[PDB]
Amino acid sequence: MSLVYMNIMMAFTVSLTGLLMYRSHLMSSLLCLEGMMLSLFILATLMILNSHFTLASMMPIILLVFAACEAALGLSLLVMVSNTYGTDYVQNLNLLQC
Amino acid sequence: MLKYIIPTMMLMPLTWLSKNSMIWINTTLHSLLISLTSLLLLNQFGDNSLNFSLTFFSDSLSTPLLILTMWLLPLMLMASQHHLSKENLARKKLFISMLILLQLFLIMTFTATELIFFYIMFEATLVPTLIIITRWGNQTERLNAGLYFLFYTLAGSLPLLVALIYIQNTMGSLNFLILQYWVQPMPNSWSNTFMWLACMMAFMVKMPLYGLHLWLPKAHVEAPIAGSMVLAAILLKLGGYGMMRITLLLNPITDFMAYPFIMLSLWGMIMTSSICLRQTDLKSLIAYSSVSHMALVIVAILIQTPWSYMGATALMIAHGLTSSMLFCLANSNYERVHSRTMILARGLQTLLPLMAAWWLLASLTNLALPPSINLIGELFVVMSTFSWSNITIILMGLNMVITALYSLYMLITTQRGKHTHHINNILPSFTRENALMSLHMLPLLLLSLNPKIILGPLY
Amino acid sequence: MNPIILIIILMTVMLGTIIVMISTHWLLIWIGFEMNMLAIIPIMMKKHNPRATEASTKYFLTQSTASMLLMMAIIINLMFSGQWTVMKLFNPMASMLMTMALAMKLGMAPFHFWVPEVTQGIPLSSGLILLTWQKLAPMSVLYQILPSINLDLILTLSILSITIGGWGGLNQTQLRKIMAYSSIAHMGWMTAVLLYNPTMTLLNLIIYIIMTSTMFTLFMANSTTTTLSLSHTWNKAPIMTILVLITLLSMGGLPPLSGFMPKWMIIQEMTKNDSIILPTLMAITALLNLYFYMRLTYSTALTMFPSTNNMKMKWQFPTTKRMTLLPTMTVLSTMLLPLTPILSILE
Amino acid sequence: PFFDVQKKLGVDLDHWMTIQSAEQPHRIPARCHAFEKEWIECAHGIGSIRAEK
Amino acid sequence: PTLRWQEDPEPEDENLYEKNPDSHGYDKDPAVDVWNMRVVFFFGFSIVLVLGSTFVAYLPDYRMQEWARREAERLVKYREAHGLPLMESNCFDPSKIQLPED
Amino acid sequence: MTGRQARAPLQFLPDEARSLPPPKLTDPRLAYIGFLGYCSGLIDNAIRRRPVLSAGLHRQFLYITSFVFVGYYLLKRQDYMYAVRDHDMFSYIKSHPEDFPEKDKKTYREVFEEFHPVR
Amino acid sequence: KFYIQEPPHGSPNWLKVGLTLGTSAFLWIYLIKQHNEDVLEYKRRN
Amino acid sequence: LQYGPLAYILGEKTTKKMTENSKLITVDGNICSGKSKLAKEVAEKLGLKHFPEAGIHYADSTTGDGKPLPVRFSGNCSLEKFYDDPKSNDGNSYRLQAWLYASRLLQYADALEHLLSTGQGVVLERSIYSDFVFLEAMYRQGFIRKQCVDHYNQVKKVTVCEYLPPHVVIYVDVPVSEVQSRIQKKGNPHEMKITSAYLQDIENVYKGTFLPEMSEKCEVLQYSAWEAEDAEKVVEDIQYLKYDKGPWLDQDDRKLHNLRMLVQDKLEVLNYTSIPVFLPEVTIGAHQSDRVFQEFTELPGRKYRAGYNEDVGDKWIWL
Amino acid sequence: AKTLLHQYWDIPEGTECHRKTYAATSIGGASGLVVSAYSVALKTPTSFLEGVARTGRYTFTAAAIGAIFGLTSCISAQVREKPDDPLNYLIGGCAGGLTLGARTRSYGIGAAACAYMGLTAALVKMGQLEGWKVFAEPKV
Amino acid sequence: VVRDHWIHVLVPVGFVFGYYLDRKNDEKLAAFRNKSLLYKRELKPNEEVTWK
Amino acid sequence: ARQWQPDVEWAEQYGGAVMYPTKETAHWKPPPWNDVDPP
């Protein structure tokens, strides 16, 4: 069952919980999202390598370029949030209430 | 029946492209011509019903109610000025077109072949009445009245749709003949009991019975005269019409499961006739009168005797006429004095000498005067329920005593004994109001001569 | 915000939805959702207030974690039977993660906490385009992967979506949060049918998009955010009143008006199975989500709130906007009752 | 909806990344090639439920 | 220091008399009020009520009553002139019945 | 419900829909569509403050033409869909005699029911 | 006359109304020819 | 619809109708002092148009016919009643003030549109910043409850913060006694019944609050009282200056496109006038609004989009 | 969950008693843990000991509702000796609603909870007894 | 008489139209012309019809 | 004019950010009408 897949899926769930529970910061949350991206990259790439499935080796590089420009958009939004305030806390977003 | 559907459509742009101070004459004249043409329908004979399509067909239950609708339209369309005669031309045309559209969906509903089509046009009747009573309610709780009306009538009426879809896809089509000629008994399971409770409880909401009747009196005391008379007469008697049609299915389980509704209807008929004996707010007495008489109608429908169904449809038509007229006299007195109360507007025997005759004659048609149609209906319901049980006639006669008591108290309260001599604004009675009273009473007496029309399917 | 740049960004939203629809490969599905996100962020922040900034932030975090959960489900699918086709999946865990990703993508009741917030601090054009396209495009993907879904997922999320989008909604005087809770209720109504007959789901999607376009067009004709502004638009012009009346009563789903064709046909092809308690529960909650429509109507066009003057000054200047398509969409959204056998337009 | 302009225009944009046993760039096999060839030729014109059974 | 309103002191009670003493029911136009009275008492009574009374006063025999009278007269005359009792019970012939056995 | 011979392009109407008879002119549904177009034109003259029942007769005629044209093609699609549904249904009826047996039409001389009188 | 700052519309244009009437007559003639060719195809095939 | 985004794409730009004639010059003076003299003189000399003073019925005078509508539709202001008795219980200061705010905002939008469209430059008089000076002074004298001043502050925060400030403000400084001598040489008895401490508070707010809140944005020319009838000095000061402050130094095209889109379709300008906070002096009841709007539609020109209106024309509504 | 509701409906009803009350405590404890998890995830009661207090309060009330529901179901089934009618679960739901009102210390809430819990318990009994496929055929 | 006032002609012509279309529907639904077991005589005297 | 219309205080109830104030929802201030938060 290719034992390394177990610990890499474990690392995925670790990075997912690190994305979801997060305190007073957004850069750490986006950086944990980047780690989750790396987890998906490594997992799909070990699959494509062991299966000799050569023509669809575009999944890791295209996954990572697209989610990298996602990260770029998120950094621009974080800079805009820290521009309209002093800091970039999860706090002080309390306006625009539910 | 398309010859009755399409001129009801064509009477609507009449109201738009008729000029100022000429919409009135054209709409009244043409709706009265529609009433004559409606009276030409009465062809129904013997063995079958009459089929005006695979879409439209008329039982002899639907014929007098249909003529009642197309007769109560011009009476209302004349009845609803002097409280909107000062309003705008566009809002006036919108109100008149709203009444025409409500007539259209009522004709749709009374000549409904299919029960799915009946449900759609049932709540299509429900739609414009909220707009009418909310926009011209002329009081401060018209919002509360229209909202209770809406959510009561939907939230009761809504799982009826689910039961009708289930019958649609377990027994084929829902023409009343092929729902008939095929209907099989449905035994005492629990799902059959819930299907029965869904259908009968939707119409229980619509009549209303006692546990669900505060639906009604706000929607009558906080509403204009057009919405009040159409609401009472045509909507409650349409609910009774619908129960009459849908009760042909579910034959065995009504004996098992139909005892507590009889009970709540009888004891609430007594309590409602008791509550409309001591109230003020003159409009509300006729509302609780309508609750009492339709509880009597409900007892008559849920017991399943041909005498009971003849008495039921006679009581429906007679009480529709009587309660609509008595609403109209209440609005006439409210236009005389801006009160709505009862102990204020006293006197009125000395002043207004002719109005006493209409008050007395409407109160006697509410009294169950014996050649009238109201006593014919109540009498056959009493005969059928004494065939049902030998003991329940006490409640019927006690309803009779209290009904005579509150109706004649309503007569001798407002219009008997001493003017309060600080009123000094009431004008002598117009020709319009007495024309409306003569349009109410004279069909009822002419049906009292020959009531072979209004007795329904089991003639 | 040049018009060339706006035409380019709207064309990329169109292109993202087309790539979602048209492909038989999972990578273009993920790229379509992702390009749809990347393009729909600068339709928001067309102003420069911090409301739109925080709204785009919330939308970006929820949308992006939904996209990453989608990619996780697809990589589990290739861990099992290995091909990139858009068909029946081969793991209940993978279908579980994928339906939760699309549930975060278009809004269910454990997931809907971004929807009223992101619709509050944006203008009406951005709310219109996000509601219509973001609830159009993943319905195609659910329509394609419907034969391999655990039923309790879809149906629990749908029941809960209808009841929470009903209950939350009786306490908002804002317009956009009312429309967002209505969107959540209609996502639930489309999702609950999806394992039974999906023609009802696509037809309900068409009807809800036409209704929402009429609603937001009648709010674009006169800049309103609260119901008091709706009463002042009673005072300035009378036809907006009756059309808010008719479109609110068609959002409610009343039988002679064309908002009843979505609910009742769903009742039909739900109860031709043996599910009856679920239709009566869903339709009693459909009775529930009509009350805020009705108090909206009582605010607009049935009672009349007292209006401030300077309407005396506003009367000289007629409403000289252009509407996107108001009258055609109004009469098609409200007068389309007897064409229910245009159900079979779809197969 | 699952629109098929993909099939209408006659453009093979998405039928080469998709499955194994296609035409690889150098004409090389996969690891489990013949298994998918037999499985696909089993379940080709079959309505995806008796394809399971 | 407040009023909270600005509208008219309302209303003036519209006495519909005192400008037309010959007036019928509704407002002060002289001609169309006469036309309303004439059309409701002509096309509501003189052509509706009395012609409806003559129409449903007599028509074909509604729900087949007098036909039933005459057919019952003929059938009772027949069944009394031919020995058998009038209204034999068991309206469906027991030759044409098949009971489930026991 | 899906293909049903999934060669199946986007294909708004196949050539096989020219075998069933086309919908007639002044069928009541396209007349209802024309009335809905006329009401659309009336309310379009009502949205802007131009006078109703005038000043837009080219827009009235354009709305009626556009709705009647589109509704004509949608009605042809409706007729095609119902024809192929009935054709597939009767093909499946003919292709499987086992599951759909002839029911014994026992007449009412020998069909017993319960009675349950309402006294 | 009667108008300070003369209205941007109301004075009738002459390209758009002719364009709408032309395309509407074209659309009617096209649907009539389509319907007649469809009826003749139905009677040819049956 | 004359301008649109398609005009911005096909048609070239919005820049090349600039500059050094096209500018916002704004004469601001004290009441019965800053008047038609210097404004019409710089309009004669500089080659630059002159909008009139923002009266009560400017909305009546800017569209349709030039006849002013009666006071039931353009009010209910009654400026004569304000100069007579500014302590009524019906409330006539603030209704007048909000009507003047709508009037100033409409005429400032007209001047901004005429500046951004081809020029050639515009003079204004008693603009919106002088309007909040009028409100602050009228509250200094104690005519309005403070809550309603907070309402006007809310309207001012919503409306003005999307526009651009004027280029230059030609201020006139006149002392109190000269204003009183002019207003008692004039001869209008309603203006004869004015007081003087209200004028004093106008001067004190209009100097102490206004000029530091200009802050060299809207570059000022604070002229003396007898420095009128002097064409060369004001024209030579205007021509002999250069600009640093204000956002007008760079826009460049896109913000001006947003302004040209915003100022056209003037209901976009007027969407933020009625907020409301329910203002017990100001909010009209339902029945009065009904009969006033109906009698307003009874007018021959006002009803149903006067580009299409019958009985005046236009004989082309297609048969 | 499915396994413990199957543990509840595995018992003949009938009487194999206090297995029923043990399974009903399991149902109530699981439901209270669900509600406490959401109500500590969306409120953050500040502080953690008060969070333990709120979780213990919700779980104890829901487990008490379940326990008393199961006990009076067992007692009504032993007394009436009729495993068929849903009136025993009607009494069960009313007892659970009255103990809910005893825990929240409001009598009208207890009466309304009596009514609705009795009706829903009778409906669940009749759904298991007659046989009503909830949520799914999923076929046609 | 028509173009003088054309408003009163609307609904009687509408009723005549509805009556005509009900007769058209009755001619459309003309199956079982002489196939009932009760109302079945031989066709007589001239041409082909017993109800229309 | 003898027809009741809703007063000022009938529309005061449609104020604030929420409809039903409780012990926990009082701090929901109404949103700015410009949709512009002050810096």
Side-chain angles (χ1 to χ4, degrees), chain J residues 1-19:
Chain J
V1 64
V2 178
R3 295 291 94 193
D4 185 74
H5 53 278
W6 60 277
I7 307 300
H8 296 89
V9 79
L10 193 63
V11 288
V13 172
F15 167 65
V16 170
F17 184 77
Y19 184 78

Side-chain angles (χ1 to χ4, degrees), chain H residues 56-67:
Chain H
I56 297 170
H57 56 84
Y58 183 75
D60 294 332
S61 178
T62 189
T63 181
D65 197 359
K67 301 294 187 291

Side-chain angles (χ1 to χ4, degrees), chain H residues 60-271:
Chain H
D60 294 332
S61 178
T62 189
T63 181
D65 197 359
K67 301 294 187 291
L69 275 72
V71 298
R72 293 183 292 113
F73 306 104
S74 179
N76 304 117
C77 300
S78 69
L79 186 274
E80 299 183 353
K81 283 175 66 179
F82 176 70
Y83 282 164
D84 287 331
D85 294 328
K87 286 182 181 179
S88 68
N89 289 318
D90 289 331
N92 210 167
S93 68
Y94 192 79
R95 187 179 297 113
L96 183 145
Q97 194 72 264
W99 185 262
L100 289 179
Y101 190 78
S103 178
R104 266 70 164 267
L105 187 59
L106 180 64
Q107 68 97 32
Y108 180 76
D110 282 330
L112 194 67
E113 184 176 0
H114 195 274
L115 181 64
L116 293 175
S117 177
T118 317
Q120 297 175 354
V122 285
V123 68
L124 290 178
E125 50 194 359
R126 198 65 50 81
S127 294
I128 187 165
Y129 298 146
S130 64
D131 193 7
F132 83 93
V133 170
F134 273 176
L135 190 79
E136 288 178 353
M138 201 182 294
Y139 178 70
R140 291 285 178 87
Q141 283 293 322
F143 290 163
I144 310 102
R145 186 176 62 248
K146 188 177 180 180
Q147 181 178 1
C148 197
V149 176
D150 196 3
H151 174 78
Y152 183 80
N153 195 3
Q154 188 180 5
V155 180
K156 180 254 174 63
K157 287 181 181 180
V158 174
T159 56
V160 194
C161 294
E162 293 179 352
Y163 290 165
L164 294 182
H167 286 173
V168 290
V169 175
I170 300 169
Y171 178 78
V172 179
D173 193 2
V174 179
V176 175
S177 67
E178 292 179 352
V179 178
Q180 190 176 4
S181 67
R182 286 177 175 176
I183 202 167
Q184 291 178 354
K185 285 182 182 179
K186 185 175 179 180
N188 193 358
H190 296 160
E191 296 180 356
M192 292 292 286
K193 291 181 181 180
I194 200 65
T195 184
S196 180
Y198 173 68
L199 183 69
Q200 176 56 252
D201 287 332
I202 286 172
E203 294 185 358
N204 291 317
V205 172
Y206 195 57
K207 291 176 184 178
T209 304
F210 178 74
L211 277 308
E213 287 185 355
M214 289 297 106
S215 297
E216 290 182 354
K217 302 183 290 183
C218 309
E219 293 181 353
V220 298
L221 295 175
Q222 182 174 359
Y223 288 169
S224 177
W226 61 276
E227 291 178 351
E229 297 172 352
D230 289 345
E232 288 185 354
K233 192 60 67 182
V234 59
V235 171
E236 189 170 359
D237 288 331
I238 290 167
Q239 294 299 108
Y240 290 168
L241 69 93
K242 74 277 193 184
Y243 300 98
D244 196 2
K245 264 65 185 300
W248 285 94
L249 268 300
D250 276 324
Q251 291 293 103
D252 293 330
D253 299 334
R254 186 177 67 250
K255 294 181 183 178
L256 299 177
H257 175 73
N258 289 319
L259 291 177
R260 189 188 291 271
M261 291 296 291
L262 195 149
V263 173
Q264 292 181 358
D265 300 334
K266 296 180 183 180
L267 189 145
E268 289 181 351
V269 172
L270 296 165
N271 278 317

Side-chain angles (χ1 to χ4, degrees), chain C residues 49-51 120 122 170-174 176 225-229 291 295 299 303-306, chain K residues 3-8 10-11 13-20 31-37:
Chain C
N49 49 1
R51 295 291 180 92
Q120 187 186 6
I122 61 171
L170 302 180
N171 204 359
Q172 302 308 114
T173 63
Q174 299 294 107
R176 278 85 56 84
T225 60
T226 65
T227 66
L228 288 81
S229 298
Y291 175 71
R295 63 179 287 165
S299 64
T303 55
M304 291 87 81
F305 290 165
Chain K
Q3 183 178 1
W4 184 75
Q5 291 299 318
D7 292 334
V8 178
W10 288 98
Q13 298 179 358
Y14 295 164
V18 299
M19 179 61 206
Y20 299 103
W33 297 88
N34 206 168
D35 291 331
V36 174
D37 288 331

